[PDB]
Design an enzyme around this catalytic site. Structure first.
Site, short mmCIF file in Angstrom:
data_model
loop_
_atom_site.label_atom_id
_atom_site.label_comp_id
_atom_site.label_asym_id
_atom_site.label_seq_id
_atom_site.Cartn_x
_atom_site.Cartn_y
_atom_site.Cartn_z
CB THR A 1 -21.43 17.28 -11.03
OG1 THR A 1 -20.07 17.19 -11.22
CG2 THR A 1 -21.94 15.86 -10.86
CG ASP B 1 -22.25 14.94 -15.51
OD1 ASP B 1 -22.35 14.95 -14.27
OD2 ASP B 1 -21.48 15.69 -16.14
NE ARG C 1 -19.22 18.98 -20.18
CZ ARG C 1 -19.87 19.76 -21.04
NH1 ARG C 1 -20.30 20.97 -20.67
NH2 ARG C 1 -20.10 19.34 -22.27
CE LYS D 1 -19.01 14.18 -13.41
NZ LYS D 1 -19.70 15.49 -13.56
N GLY E 1 -19.10 18.31 -6.63
CA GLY E 1 -18.29 19.24 -5.87
C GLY E 1 -16.83 19.16 -6.28
CB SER F 1 -23.69 22.84 -11.60
OG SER F 1 -23.16 21.89 -12.51
CG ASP G 1 -25.27 22.28 -15.37
OD1 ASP G 1 -25.09 23.52 -15.33
OD2 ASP G 1 -24.65 21.48 -14.64
CB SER H 1 -23.87 18.19 -16.53
OG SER H 1 -24.10 18.74 -15.25
#
Ligand SMILES: [Cl-]
Ligand SMILES: [Mg+2]
Ligand SMILES: [Mg+2]
Ligand SMILES: [Mg+2]
Ligand SMILES: [Mg+2]
Ligand SMILES: [Mg+2]
EC number: 3.4.25.1
Lengths: 222, 204, 241, 231, 250, 244, 195, 196, 243
Positions: free
Chosen positions: A1, A17, A19, A33, A47, A129, A166, A169
Site C-alpha cells: 500500500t 491506492d 492494490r 483503503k 498493513g 510500502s 512501489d 501499490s
C-alpha cells in the site's frame, strides 16, 4: 500500500491506492483503503487488510455509540485514542497502520497510528510500502497554507508516486476531502490511470467445447 | 505441514449477464495421496452459494457453521439471507478467530433476489472481503486461476457462454496443479433456476 | 410492607426508597443556587458551621470534579463525598479513554445512570443526594446540569436546591421573565456572583457574612472556589450599591 | 427480640445480640483459670464429662513451644481459632525466624473474631480463650472474648462460676505475681484459685487439667496421674 | 458484601398475577401520554414534554430518541428507566447485529432485543422490572415501515396506531375514528397533533411537544457524500419551528 | 440481610406441591386457548389471540404460533416474553443437534431439553418459573407426526389432541367427543375451529382473533411443509367450514 | 497401531485391522483388536498415537451407548460419523489434540445400505467404497481402484481384502502380524476367525 | 533519541531532538518528545514510541485523578508513578524516561528512569542513543545554579553534538522551560545549531 | 414500620436507623479526645480499670497508622481495629504509588469512604465507633473525627464517648482562651485535665490515662506515645485541677 494525508486551509484530505497483494500476486485490483469511522472522520489503512477493516469498524461502531451517548459530534482525537489503545494492547499483532483524519467541533486534524500503538501529528503524512515514494513527493512539493485544490493535487501526486514506483501499490487513486463546515466528500476512483488495454482476441469458446458427464437441476426453493 | 495445502482443491466464481457461475474441483488428498474424488467444495444456503478451499476439516466445519447461522437467521428474519449480508457474516465469523484461524479460502456467489444484481466475493483466511465485478479465485491453483480468468474473461457473457469460460478456466488451471482436479462441478445460477454440471477432466 | 424497604414497585407504581432518599436531601438544611453568565457559571451554597470546635475550612459541599467541572451537593456529606469521588474517577477515565475533557452534561448523564441502577437493583441503596454540575463547556458554553436519587437529570438556565428551593426558584423565574433572556447579561464573573448572592438574599430574606456562604465559579478552562475574603470583597460591593 | 436474627443487625440501644448470645455459651462452659508471675504463666482448667462412661473434654491446646490457650464454650470454635493461632505462630517462625509475640497473637484473634460480627451469613465464635505465653518481654496472660475484645491480665477466669476464682485472684494479686522461679507454687495458687469456683464436685485425677509456660519451660500440659501432686 | 439478592423479586401470586409487572404497568399509566401512527410512506411518534420547572431547559431532555438511522423510540412511564434502555438498545443494535452483518437490524429484531432485556428484569435476581412502555417506530428494506409497543413484561405488539400513558384510553379511541390504510405521512402528523392536544392541558406548541418521523431518506443529514448506496437516515426529529407551522393549519 | 425479601420460589407446600408452578399454571389458564390436533396425514395448530383491538396490525403479527425449525412448531399459552426466551433456546438446540449429527432433531429430544430447562427453574436458582405452556407440533422419520405439551413444572406428555390455556376442561371434553384415529387433516382443521368457537369467551370467532398452522406431508413426495396461515387464509377456512 | 483398512460392498462393510502392538524394538502383542463396537450395526477401527487411540475409541463408544439408552434407538452410521468428526474437529485446536485416525463401518437399517466413513485426526470426513489410514493406502488404493466392483458379495470382498493383506505383507517394511477382520451387515457385527 | 533535562536557578529546562526512526528511515522528523503529564511536570521520552506514549498517557491520567483528590502532585510523586509502571512491566517495555517538574517549595527537579525501572534524582540527566556521545561534554560543562540563558545554551550545544554524531537523532531541538513564571516552549532549527 | 431492622434502608424521614443505632454503641463507650495545637495534634483516651488484674500500661488503645498518623476511638473496640487495619492498607498503597506519606485529609477520606460503604448494603453492619485521628503533613497539622455514617470534618478539638459533652465544653474554653494557638506540651497537659474532667461521667470504676502526640518540633512530625516523666507531669497537672 501507499496512503497519504494532507492538511489545507479549511480542512484535511486523505488518499490511497487500490492494490491488495498476497505475496507477489495482486488479489484485488480495486480495493477500498479509505474507511469511514464517522461521517466526518475518515481513515486510510495500510498493513494487514482484515485488521485495518476490523479495527476501523470496531472503533467506528464504538464512536457512533459514544456520539449518541454524548449528544455530540465525534472528535478525531477520540478515534485516535481508542485506536491506539486497542492496537497497543495487542502489541503489534493486529497489523493496522492508519492515517486518521477529519473535522470536528474542535477543528481539522491529521494523525497517523503505527500497529504497536504510537501516534504522531503532522501537516502531511504517508504510510505503507509506498510511503517513501509518497513522502519524497510530499517533502518536495508541500508548503504551508495550501488550498483545497492544491492539497488534493499534492495528495494524489504522492499516491501516484507509490502507484508507479512501489510494486506493493497500483491501480487507482481514492480521495476523501474533509472540509470544516461542509460534508466530507468521498471520491472513489478519483483517478484511474491504469485501465487495461483492449485484448487482442476474444476467447469466447464454441458452445459444446467442454466435455460434460452429468447434468441436473438444483433445487434452491423450500 | 502447511495447513492450506495438505488436502488441495480450488474454487472459482464469475459474473455474467444477469447470472453468476461458481465452480470447484472434486479432489481431497493427503499431500501426495489422492483419497477422495467426490469431495465437493460448494455449498448453498437458500439462493446464496458458498465455495470453500483449504483444510478440508475446516471446509466441513464452516459449512456446518454457516448452515447453523443462516438457519437461525431465516427463523428470526423470516427471509432468506442475501449474498451481501452473508458475505458480511462470513467476514465477521472468520475474524472472530483472528489469532487461531480456519485455514480456508471461501468464495461467495449469488444473485440478490431484491435487486437482481449478480454478486461475488472472496475472503482470506482471516476475513478480509475481496469484492469483484468479474471473478474471484481460491485454492492451491489460485495463481493458475488468476492467469486463466484474467485472459479468458469478458464482461456480460450469456449463461451458456459463461459456462464454457469458467469451465475452461478451472480445468486448465487444475491440470497445472498436482493437488487440484480429480473431477469438477460447475454451478450456473440465474434469477430463479440453477443448473449443476459435472465436467469430464483428466484423472491424474 | 417490604415494598417500602427495597427498590421494588408499590401497588401504585411508586418507589418509596427513592422518595425517602429525596427527603434525605434536605437533612443538612442548606440551600444552593446556580446561575449562568455570558462567560461563566456561578454556583453558591449556604455554609452553616454550628460547632465552634469545627475547622470551618474543611466544611464544604462544593467539589472540584475536574479542572473544568464543579459540583455542589445537597444532602449528607458521606453520600456527597461518595458521589464526588466517583465523579472524579469517571471524569478522569473519560479523558484517558476518549482524549478530551468530559463535558458537564455527559458526566451528569453518567452519574444519573449510576443513580438509576440503584433504583432498579435491590442490594444498592440510592444516595440521598442531589448533585448540581457546573462548567463552561467548550461546545455548549455555560452549563448547569442536575442529578437526583431517581436518576433524573436535565439542563438548566438557572436552578436552586434545598428546603427553601421554591422561593429561590420563583425569584429567579421572575427575573428571567423580566430580563427576557436565558442568562445574566454580565461581563465579569464577579458581578454574576454578586447577582447570585443578591437574589439569594432577597428570596431567603436573610443577610450573609463572609462565613455564611460558599461560592464556586466556572470559567473557560477552570472551575474554582472562592475564599472567605473573596466573598467578603463581593459582599462589600453589594452593600455599596 | 426483633434484632437478634443475625450479627449484622444493631438493636435500638446499640447492642449486638448474636454476639451476646455467643458470650452466653462461654458462661455455660466449664471453669478455666489463668494466672502469671514474672517468670511463668499457668493455665488451670476444670474438665467436663458427659457421664461416668465418657472421657473428660480437653480444655487446653498448645499453639507453639512458647504459647498455648485454654477454652470455655464451643470446643470446635476453639479448634478453629487455635488452628489459626498455630498457623500465625508458624508463619512468624518460617518467614521471620521470630517467635510470635503474645500481644500480636491477641491482636490477630481480635481481628479474626471481628469479621464474623459485621457480615451477613456468618456467626460469632461461641468460645472464650485464655492465652498464656512467654516471649521476648516475659510472661503473659490474655483473655479472648468472641466479641473481639482481647485483654492482657495478671490473672483471670472464664466459664461457669468464674467469678469466685476471679475474686480470689484479685485478692491474691500481690502474692502470686512474685512467685518467680517456682513452677509448683504458681500452679498451687492457680489450683486454689479454681477451687473457689467448685460446687458439689471436687478436683479429681481425671478432672483437673494444668498447663505451664515460662523462662526455661516449653508450653506443656499435665493430665491424669501428673496432676495428682496438686490435689 | 456482594449482591446477596440472587433470587427473583418478581414472583407469581396465588391468583397468577406477576405483581411487579402489574405495578410497573401502573407506573406507565401515571406517565405522560405518548403515541404512534403508521402511514403508508412513514411513521410518526409524538409525546408531550412535561417540564419539571420553567427554569429547566426542556431541549436538553429528549423523550424521543434515535436508536438506529431508521429506528426511533418514545415512551411513557419512568424517564430514567427509559434513558438506560435507550443506551442498552443502541449498543445491542451494534453488538448483536451490525458488528455481525455489517448493516442495521430490522425494526422487529431490535424490538425483540429490547423486549429480551426487559423480560430479564422480570426474572433475574435482585432487580425490579422496568417502569416503562416503549413505542418503537422504524423502517427496513424487506418489512417497510412498522410500529411496535414494548411493555414492562417484555411483550411486544405491532400497531397501525396506538397511544400509551395518561390519556391512552381516549387517545386510542380518537385514533380508531381517524386511521385508515391510505394515510399519507403528512395526514398522520396532522392526526398525531390533534390526538395529543386532547391529553395536553397547558401550552401546546413546538417547545412543549416532541415529535419525530420515520420517512424518506435524508441525504442532507448523512454528513458525507460519495457512496451511492448510503442515502441517509429515515429518522428525523421535527424542529420546534416545523411543529408550529403545522399548528396553524390545524 | 436479604433473606427477609426471599419468596423461596423453589420449595414444597406441606401437601408436596410447588407453589410457584401451581400459580404459574393459574396464570396460564387465563391466556388465550391453543389447540393441537394430530391426524394421520398431518397436524393442526389453532390458537385464539388475547382480546384484540381493531388498530392492531394483524398480518405482521406473531403471538401464539412460532416456528422452531422446518419440521417443528409450537403453540404458546402464557407470557409471550417468557416464551420467546425458551423459543430461542429451542431454536439454537435444534441447530446444535443438526450441526453435531447432520440430521434434523427428533421432536421428543427437543421437547425433553426445553422441558428440562423449565424443571431446573423449579428445583434450584431461586428464580420464578417460566409462565408458559407449549403445544409442540412436529414430524420426524422415527415416530412421524407428534403432538406434545409442556408446562412450567417441566413435565411433558404426548397427545392425539390437546388444548392449553383457557377453558381446557371444556375444550378437552369436546375434542374427546369428536376425535377419531383415522381422521384426516382437513377434518382436524374443522374440529380445531369448531372447538375454539364453542369454548371462546368472545361473542363470535373471527379471522382477526386467530392464528392457524398446519404441518402436512402435503408437499411433493415424502417431505414435510409448514404452513403458517395468513389472515386472508384464516378468513377463507372460517367461511369454508361455515363458522362465518 | 498402523494398518486399518475398510471395504464397502453390496450388502456389508468389511474392516481389517493389524494385530501388532510394537513399542521400540519389541512387538509386545500380536493379537490386538484395534476396534470398538459403537452400536449393534456400527463398528469403529482406529490407529495413531499410543494411549490416545483406545482412550478416544472408548470415549466415543460410551457416548453412543449413552445415546442408545437415552432414546431407545440406534443412531445412523452417518449420524455417528458426524458426531465423531466433530469431536476430532474440536480436538485439533485443543491444548493436546487426539492423534487418532478412524474408519467407521456401519449398516444403515433404515436405508438397508452399508456405509464406510474415513476420518483422520484433523476431523476430515469422507464416505468411501474403500478406505485406508497411514501408509497402507499407498498400496491398497491403487489395488482396489483396479479390482473393486460396487456389486461384490461379502465373499468377494473378503477375497479382495486377502489381496490387499498379501500386498502389504510383501512390500511393507514392518511385520504387522496379520489382521483381524470384521463384517458389518443387516445382522450386525461378526468376526472372521480364520484369516 | 537524544534527550536531556537540566535544573537551574529559576527551575528546570527539558530538551529533545525531533527524530523518530524505523531502522534508518526517518518516520517523523518533527516529533515532540517533550510531553506534559501535568501543568508543570513534563517528561522526555526515549525508547519505543508506543511504549513511552502509552506510559505517559497512563501517568497523565493518574496525576489528573491525584489532582482531583489531593491537589498538585510533587515531581517526586510523578516520577514514582512512572517508575511503578516501568518497573512492574520491565519485561514488556522499552522506555527510557526523564521526568522534570517545578515546585515552588522544591524548585526544579529531575528524575531519570532507565530500562530496568530504577529511579535516580540528579541535577541534570541525559538519555537516548545520542546521550552516549555527550557524557564527556555535559560533565565538563554543567554547573549548578546556571541562568536561563546559560542553561538554554548548555542544552543547545549538548543536543547539537548528540545530533551530530547519532544517526538516530536529528531535526529540530525542542525545549520546554519550567519556572514560577510559567511554561515556555522553545524551538531551534538546524541552520542555527549545526554551525555551533 | 420495620425500617430499622435492615441497614441501608431509608425511613420515611430519610434516615438510616441502623447507623443511628450504631451511634448508640459509640455513646456507650469510654471517652476519647483530640486537641489540635500550634504544629501538631494530641490524642487522649479513658481506659476503665475493670479489675486489679488488668496489667497497667499494657492494654494500649491509641493506634498508629503509617508513621505520622494517630487514631483513637470510642465504642466497639474491635470495629475500631478493623478500621485502622484498613487505614494502614490505604496508607501503604498511597505511599507505594505516590512515594510521599499519605496527607491527613487524603487519609480522612479513605476512612470516610470505607465507613460510608458500610451504610450502602443490608449485608454489612455499620461501624460501632466514632474515630478521632490526625497528624502532621506537608501542610501542617490536621485533626479529624469520623462517625458511623461516614461523616467527618476537620476539628480544632474533638471528643466522643460517654463524657463527650463534658469534654466538648472544656474544649470550647481552650479555643476561646487561646485564639493564637496552644503549644504541643500545653495540649498534652490539657488533654490529661479534660479526660479527668470527662471521667466524672464514668466514675464508678477508676481509670488509666493514655496520651499520644504528633508535633513538628516536639516529635519531629512522627506519632509517639507520651510516657514516663512527661506522662506523670501531665497526670499531676490534671490531679491539681480537679481539686
Ligand atoms: Cl452509563
Ligand atoms: Mg492435476
Ligand atoms: Mg496424479
Ligand atoms: Mg436499591
Ligand atoms: Mg512492547
Ligand atoms: Mg543526526
Amino acid at each position: 500500500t501507499t496512503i497519504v494525508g494532507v492538511k489545507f486551509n479549511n480542512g484535511v484530505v486523505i488518499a490511497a491506492d487500490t492494490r491488495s497483494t498476497q505475496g507477489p500476486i495482486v488479489a484485488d485490483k480495486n480495493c477500498a483503503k479509505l474507511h469511514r469511522i464517522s461521517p466526518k472522520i475518515w481513515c486510510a489503512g495500510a498493513g494487514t487488510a482484515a485488521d485495518t477493516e476490523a479495527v476501523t469498524q470496531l472503533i467506528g461502531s464504538n464512536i457512533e455509540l459514544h456520539s449518541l451517548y454524548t449528544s455530540r459530534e465525534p472528535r478525531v482525537v477520540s478515534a485516535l485514542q481508542m485506536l491506539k489503545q486497542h492496537l497497543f494492547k495487542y502489541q503489534g499483532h493486529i497489523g493496522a497502520y492508519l492515517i486518521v483524519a477529519g473535522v470536528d467541533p474542535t477543528g481539522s486534524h491529521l494523525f497517523s497510528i503505527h500497529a504497536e500503538g504510537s501516534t504522531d501529528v503532522g501537516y502531511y503524512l504517508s504510510l505503507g510500502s509506498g510511503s517513501l515514494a509518497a513522502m519524497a513527493v510530499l517533502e518536495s512539493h508541500w508548503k504551508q497554507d495550501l488550498t483545497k485544490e492544491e492539497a488534493i493535487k499534492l495528495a494524489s501526486d504522492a499516491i501516484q508516486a507509490g502507484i508507479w514506483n512501489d510494486l506493493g501499490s497500483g491501480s487507482n487513486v481514492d480521495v476523501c476531502v474533509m472540509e470544516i463546515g461542509k460534508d466530507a466528500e468521498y471520491l472513489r476512483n478519483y483517478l484511474t490511470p491504469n485501465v487495461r488495454e483492449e485484448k487482442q482476441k476474444s476467447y469466447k469458446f464454441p458452445r459444446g467445447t467442454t466435455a460434460v458427464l452429468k447434468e441436473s437441476i438444483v433445487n434452491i426453493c423450500d | 505441514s502447511d495447513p492450506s495445502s495438505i488436502n488441495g482443491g480450488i474454487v472459482v466464481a464469475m459474473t455474467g449477464k444477469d447470472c453468476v457461475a461458481i465452480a470447484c474441483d472434486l479432489r481431497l488428498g493427503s499431500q501426495s495421496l489422492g483419497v477422495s474424488n467426490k469431495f465437493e467444495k460448494i455449498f448453498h444456503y437458500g439462493h446464496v452459494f458458498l465455495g470453500i478451499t483449504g483444510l478440508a476439516t475446516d471446509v466441513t466445519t464452516l459449512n456446518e457453521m454457516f448452515r447453523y447461522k443462516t438457519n437461525l437467521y431465516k427463523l428470526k428474519e423470516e427471509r432468506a439471507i442475501e449474498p451481501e449480508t452473508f458475505t458480511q457474516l462470513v467476514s465477521s465469523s472468520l475474524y472472530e478467530r483472528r489469532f487461531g484461524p480456519y485455514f480456508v479460502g471461501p468464495v461467495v456467489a449469488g444473485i440478490n433476489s431484491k435487486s437482481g444484481k449478480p454478486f461475488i466475493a472472496g475472503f482470506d483466511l482471516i476475513g478480509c472481503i475481496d469484492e469483484a465485478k468479474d471473478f474471484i479465485v481460491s485454492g492451491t491453483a489460485s495463481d493458475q486461476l488468476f492467469g486463466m480468468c484474467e485472459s479468458l474473461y469478458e464482461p456480460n457473457l450469456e449463461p451458456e457462454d459463461l459456462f464454457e469460460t469458467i469451465s475452461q478456466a478451472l480445468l486448465n488451471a487444475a491440470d497445472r496443479d498436482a493437488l487440484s482436479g480429480w473431477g469438477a462441478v460447475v454451478y450456473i445460477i440465474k434469477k430463479d433456476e440453477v443448473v449443476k454440471r459435472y465436467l469430464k477432466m483428466r484423472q491424474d | 410492607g417490604y415494598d417500602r424497604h427495597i427498590t421494588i414497585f408499590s401497588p401504585e407504581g411508586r418507589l418509596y426508597q427513592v422518595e425517602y432518599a429525596f427527603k434525605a436531601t434536605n437533612q443538612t438544611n442548606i440551600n444552593s443556587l446556580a446561575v449562568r453568565g455570558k462567560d461563566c457559571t456561578v454556583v453558591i451554597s449556604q455554609k452553616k458551621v454550628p460547632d465552634k470546635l469545627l475547622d470551618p475550612t474543611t466544611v464544604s459541599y462544593i467539589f472540584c470534579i475536574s479542572r473544568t467541572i464543579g459540583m455542589v451537593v445537597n444532602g449528607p456529606i458521606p453520600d456527597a463525598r461518595n458521589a464526588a469521588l466517583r465523579a472524579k474517577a469517571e471524569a478522569a477515565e473519560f479523558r484517558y479513554k476518549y482524549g478530551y475533557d468530559m463535558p458537564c452534561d455527559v458526566l451528569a448523564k453518567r452519574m444519573a445512570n449510576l443513580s438509576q441502577i440503584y433504583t432498579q437493583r435491590a442490594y444498592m441503596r440510592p444516595l440521598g443526594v442531589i448533585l448540581t454540575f457546573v462548567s463552561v463547556d467548550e461546545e455548549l458554553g455555560p452549563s448547569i446540569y442536575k442529578t437526583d436519587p431517581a436518576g433524573y437529570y436535565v439542563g438548566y438556565k438557572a436552578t436552586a436546591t434545598g428546603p427553601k428551593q421554591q422561593e429561590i426558584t420563583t425569584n429567579l423565574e421572575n427575573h428571567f421573565k423580566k430580563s427576557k433572556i436565558d442568562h445574566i447579561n454580565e461581563e465579569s464573573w464577579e458581578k454574576v456572583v454578586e447577582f447570585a448572592i443578591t437574589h439569594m438574599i432577597d428570596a431567603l430574606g436573610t443577610e450573609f457574612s463572609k462565613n455564611d456562604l460558599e461560592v464556586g465559579v466556572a470559567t473557560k478552562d477552570k472551575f474554582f472556589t472562592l475564599s472567605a475574603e473573596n466573598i467578603e470583597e463581593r459582599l462589600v460591593a453589594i452593600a455599596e450599591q | 427480640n426483633n434484632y437478634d436474627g443475625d450479627t449484622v443487625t444493631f438493636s435500638p440501644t446499640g447492642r449486638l445480640f448474636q454476639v451476646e448470645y455467643a458470650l452466653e455459651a462461654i458462661k455455660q462452659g466449664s471453669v478455666t483459670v489463668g494466672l502469671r508471675s514474672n517468670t511463668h504463666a499457668v493455665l488451670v482448667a476444670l474438665k467436663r464429662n458427659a457421664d461416668e462412661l465418657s472421657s473428660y473434654q480437653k480444655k487446653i491446646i498448645k499453639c507453639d513451644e512458647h504459647m498455648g490457650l485454654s477454652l470455655a464454650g464451643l470446643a470446635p470454635d476453639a479448634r478453629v481459632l487455635s488452628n489459626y493461632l498455630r498457623q500465625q505462630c508458624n508463619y512468624s517462625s518460617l518467614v521471620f525466624n521470630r517467635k510470635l509475640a503474645v500481644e500480636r497473637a491477641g491482636h490477630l484473634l481480635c481481628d479474626k473474631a471481628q469479621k464474623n460480627t459485621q457480615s451477613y451469613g456468618g456467626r460469632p465464635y461461641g468460645v472464650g480463650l485464655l492465652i498464656i505465653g512467654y516471649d521476648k518481654s516475659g510472661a503473659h496472660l490474655l483473655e479472648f472474648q468472641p466479641s473481639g475484645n482481647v485483654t492482657e491480665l495478671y490473672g483471670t477466669a472464664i466459664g461457669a462460676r468464674s467469678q469466685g476464682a476471679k475474686t480470689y485472684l484479685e485478692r491474691t494479686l500481690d502474692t502470686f505475681i512474685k512467685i518467680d522461679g517456682n513452677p509448683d507454687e504458681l500452679i498451687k495458687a492457680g489450683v486454689e484459685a479454681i477451687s473457689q469456683s467448685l460446687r458439689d464436685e471436687s478436683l479429681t485425677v481425671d478432672n483437673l487439667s494444668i498447663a505451664i509456660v515460662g523462662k526455661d519451660t516449653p508450653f506443656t500440659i499435665y493430665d491424669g496421674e501428673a496432676v495428682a501432686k496438686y490435689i | 458484601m456482594t449482591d446477596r439478592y440472587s433470587f427473583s423479586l418478581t414472583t407469581f401470586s396465588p391468583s397468577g398475577k406477576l405483581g411487579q409487572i402489574d405495578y410497573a404497568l401502573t407506573a406507565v399509566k401515571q406517565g405522560v401520554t405518548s403515541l404512534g401512527i403508521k402511514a403508508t410512506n412513514g411513521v410518526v411518534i409524538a409525546t408531550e414534554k412535561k417540564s419539571s420547572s420553567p427554569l429547566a431547559m426542556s431541549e436538553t431532555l429528549s423523550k424521543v430518541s434515535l436508536l438506529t438511522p431508521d429506528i426511533g423510540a418514545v415512551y411513557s412511564g419512568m424517564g430514567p428507566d427509559y434513558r438506560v434502555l435507550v443506551d442498552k438498545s443502541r449498543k445491542v443494535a451494534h453488538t448483536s447485529y451490525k458488528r455481525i452483518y455489517g448493516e442495521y437490524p430490522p425494526t422487529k429484531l431490535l424490538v425483540s432485543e429490547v423486549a429480551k432485556i426487559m423480560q430479564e428484569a422480570t426474572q433475574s435476581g435482585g432487580v425490579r422490572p422496568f417502569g416503562v412502555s416503549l413505542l418503537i417506530a422504524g423502517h427496513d428494506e424487506f418489512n417497510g415501515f412498522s410500529l411496535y409497543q414494548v411493555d414492562p413484561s417484555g411483550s411486544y405488539f405491532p400497531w397501525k396506531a396506538t397511544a400509551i400513558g395518561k390519556g391512552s384510553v381516549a387517545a386510542k379511541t380518537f385514533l380508531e375514528k381517524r386511521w385508515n390504510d391510505e394515510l399519507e405521512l403528512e395526514d398522520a402528523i396532522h392526526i398525531a397533533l390533534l390526538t395529543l392536544k386532547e391529553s395536553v392541558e397547558g401550552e401546546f406548541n413546538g417547545d412543549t411537544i416532541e415529535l419525530a418521523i420515520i420517512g424518506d431518506e435524508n441525504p442532507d443529514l448523512l454528513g458525507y457524500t460519495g457512496i451511492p448506496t448510503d442515502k441517509g437516515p429515515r429518522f428525523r426529529k421535527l424542529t420546534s419551528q416545523e411543529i408550529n407551522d403545522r399548528l396553524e393549519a390545524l | 440481610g436479604s433473606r427477609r425479601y426471599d419468596s423461596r420460589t423453589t420449595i414444597f407446600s406441606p401437601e408436596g406441591r410447588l407453589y410457584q408452578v401451581e400459580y404459574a399454571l393459574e396464570s396460564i389458564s387465563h391466556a388465550g386457548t391453543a389447540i393441537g390436533i394430530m391426524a394421520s396425514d398431518g397436524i393442526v395448530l389453532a390458537a385464539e389471540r388475547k382480546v384484540t383491538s381493531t388498530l392492531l396490525e394483524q398480518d405482521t403479527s406473531t403471538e401464539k404460533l412460532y416456528k422452531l425449525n422446518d419440521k417443528i412448531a409450537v403453540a404458546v399459552a402464557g407470557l409471550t416474553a417468557d416464551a420467546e426466551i425458551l423459543i430461542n433456546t429451542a431454536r439454537i438446540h435444534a441447530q446444535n443437534y443438526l450441526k453435531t449429527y447432520n440430521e434434523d432433531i427428533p421432536v421428543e429430544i427437543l421437547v425433553r431439553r426445553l422441558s428440562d430447562i423449565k424443571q431446573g427453574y423449579t428445583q434450584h436458582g431461586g428464580l420464578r418459573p417460566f409462565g408458559v405452556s407449549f403445544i409442540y407440533a412436529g414430524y420426524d422419520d422415527r415416530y412421524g407426526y407428534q403432538l406434545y405439551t409442556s408446562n412450567p413444572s417441566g413435565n411433558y406428555t404426548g397427545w392425539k389432541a390437546i388444548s392449553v390455556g383457557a377453558n381446557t376442561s371444556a375444550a378437552q371434553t369436546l375434542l374427546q367427543m369428536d376425535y377419531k384415529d383415522d381422521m384426516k387433516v382437513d377434518d382436524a382443521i374443522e374440529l380445531a375451529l369448531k372447538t375454539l368457537s364453542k369454548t371462546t369467551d368472545s361473542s363470535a370467532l373471527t379471522y382477526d382473533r386467530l392464528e392457524f398452522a398446519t404441518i402436512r406431508k402435503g408437499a411433493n413426495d415424502g417431505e414435510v411443509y409448514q404452513k403458517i396461515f395468513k389472515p386472508q387464509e384464516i378468513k377463507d377456512i372460517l367461511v369454508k367450514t361455515g363458522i362465518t | 497401531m498402523d494398518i486399518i483398512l475398510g471395504i464397502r460392498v453390496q450388502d456389508s462393510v468389511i474392516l481389517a485391522s493389524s494385530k501388532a502392538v510394537t513399542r521400540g524394538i519389541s512387538v509386545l502383542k500380536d493379537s490386538d483388536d484395534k476396534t470398538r463396537q459403537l452400536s449393534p450395526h456400527t463398528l469403529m477401527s482406529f490407529a495413531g498415537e499410543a494411549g490416545d487411540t483406545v482412550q478416544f475409541a472408548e470415549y466415543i463408544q460410551a457416548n453412543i451407548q449413552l445415546y442408545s439408552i437415552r432414546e431407545d434407538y440406534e443412531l445412523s452410521p452417518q449420524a455417528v460419523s458426524s458426531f465423531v468428526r466433530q469431536e476430532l474437529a474440536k480436538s485439533i485446536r485443543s491444548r493436546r489434540p487426539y492423534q487418532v485416525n478412524v474408519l467407521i463401518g456401519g449398516y444403515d437399517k433404515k436405508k438397508n445400505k452399508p456405509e464406510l466413513y474415513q476420518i483422520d485426526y484433523l476431523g476430515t470426513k469422507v464416505e468411501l467404497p474403500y478406505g485406508a489410514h497411514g501408509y497402507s493406502g499407498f498400496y491398497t488404493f491403487s489395488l482396489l481402484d483396479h479390482h473393486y466392483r460396487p456389486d461384490m458379495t461379502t465373499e468377494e470382498g473378503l477375497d479382495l481384502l486377502k489381496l490387499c493383506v498379501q500386498e502389504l505383507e510383501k512390500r511393507m517394511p514392518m511385520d504387522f502380524k496379520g489382521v483381524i477382520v470384521k463384517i458389518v451387515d443387516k445382522d450386525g457385527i461378526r468376526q472372521v476367525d480364520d484369516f | 533519541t537524544s534527550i536531556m533535562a537540566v535544573t537551574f536557578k529559576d527551575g528546570v529546562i527539558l530538551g529533545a531532538d525531533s527524530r523518530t526512526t524505523t531502522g534508518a528511515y526517518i518516520a517523523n522528523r518533527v516529533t515532540d518528545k517533550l510531553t506534559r503529564v501535568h501543568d508543570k511536570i513534563w517528561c522526555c521520552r526515549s525508547g519505543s514510541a508506543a511504549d513511552t506514549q502509552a506510559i505517559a498517557d497512563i501517568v497523565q491520567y493518574h496525576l489528573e485523578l491525584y489532582t482531583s483528590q489531593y491537589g498538585t502532585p510533587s515531581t517526586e510523586t510523578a516520577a514514582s508513578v512512572f517508575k511503578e509502571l516501568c518497573y512492574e512491566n520491565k519485561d514488556n517495555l522499552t522506555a527510557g524516561i526523564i521526568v522534570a517538574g517545578y515546585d515552588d517549595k522544591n524548585k526544579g527537579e529531575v528524575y531519570t528512569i532507565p530500562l530496568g525501572g530504577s529511579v535516580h534524582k540528579l541535577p541534570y540527566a541525559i538519555a537516548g542513543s545520542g546521550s552516549t556521545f555527550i557524557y564527556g561534554y555535559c560533565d565538563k560543562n554543567f554547573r549548578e545554579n546556571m541562568s536561563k540563558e546559560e542553561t538554554v545554551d548548555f542544552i543547545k550545544h549538548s543536543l547539537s553534538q548528540a545530533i551530530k554524531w547519532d544517526g538516530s537523532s536529528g531535526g529540530v531541538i525542542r525545549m520546554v522551560v519550567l519556572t514560577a513564571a510559567g511554561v515556555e516552549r522553545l524551538i531551534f532549527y538546524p541552520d542555527e545549531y549545526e554551525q555551533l | 414500620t420495620g425500617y430499622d431492622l435492615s441497614n441501608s434502608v431509608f425511613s420515611p424521614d430519610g434516615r438510616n436507623f441502623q447507623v443511628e443505632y450504631a451511634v448508640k454503641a459509640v455513646e456507650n463507650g469510654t471517652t476519647s479526645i483530640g486537641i489540635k495545637c500550634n504544629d501538631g495534634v494530641v490524642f487522649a483516651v479513658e481506659k476503665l480499670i475493670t479489675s486489679k488484674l488488668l496489667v497497667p500500661q499494657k492494654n494500649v488503645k491509641i493506634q498508629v497508622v503509617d508513621r505520622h498518623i494517630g487514631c483513637v476511638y470510642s465504642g466497639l473496640i474491635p470495629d475500631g481495629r478493623h478500621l485502622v487495619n484498613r487505614g494502614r492498607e490505604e496508607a501503604a498503597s498511597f505511599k507505594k504509588l505516590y512515594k510521599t506519606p499519605i496527607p491527613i485529609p487524603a487519609f480522612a477520606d479513605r476512612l470516610g469512604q470505607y465507613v460510608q460503604a458500610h451504610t450502602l448494603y443490608n449485608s454489612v453492619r455499620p461501624f460501632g465507633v466514632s474515630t478521632i485521628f490526625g497528624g502532621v503533613d506537608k501542610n501542617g497539622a490536621h485533626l479529624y473525627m469520623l462517625e458511623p455514617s461516614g461523616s467527618y470534618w476537620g476539628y480544632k478539638g474533638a471528643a466522643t464517648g460517654k463524657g463527650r459533652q463534658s469534654a466538648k465544653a472544656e474544649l470550647e474554653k481552650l479555643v476561646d482562651h487561646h485564639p493564637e494557638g496552644l503549644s504541643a506540651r500545653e495540649a498534652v497537659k490539657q488533654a490529661a485535665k479534660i479526660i479527668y474532667l470527662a471521667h466524672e461521667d464514668n466514675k464508678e470504676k477508676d481509670f488509666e490515662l493514655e496520651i499520644s502526640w504528633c508535633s513538628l518540633s516536639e516529635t519531629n512530625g512522627l506519632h509517639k506515645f507520651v510516657k514516663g516523666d512527661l506522662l506523670q507531669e501531665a497526670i499531676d497537672f490534671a490531679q491539681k485541677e480537679i481539686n
